[PDB]
Amino acid sequence: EWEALEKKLAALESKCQALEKKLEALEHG
Amino acid sequence: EWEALEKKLAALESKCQALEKKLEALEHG
């Protein structure tokens, strides 16, 4: 269960970095 | 303690999925 929590948090951190990147590309690109 | 953190993670997963769909909408007009 701990590993599953850590993996889900890491996946969300990566998804948020990817979304902020795509937002910046849409706004400025 | 654990159950509340899992609930917060599930709500954050729902929120990120919604942001990804909204950002895809904006990329298409």
Place this chain on the structure above:
Amino acid sequence: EWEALEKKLAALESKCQALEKKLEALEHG
């Protein structure tokens, strides 16, 4: 380790809220 997991989730929640508000602005120009 548990406290680190909670502080990281709190930081992700703040970052996703910021993404949400920024996407709302872009949606409107």
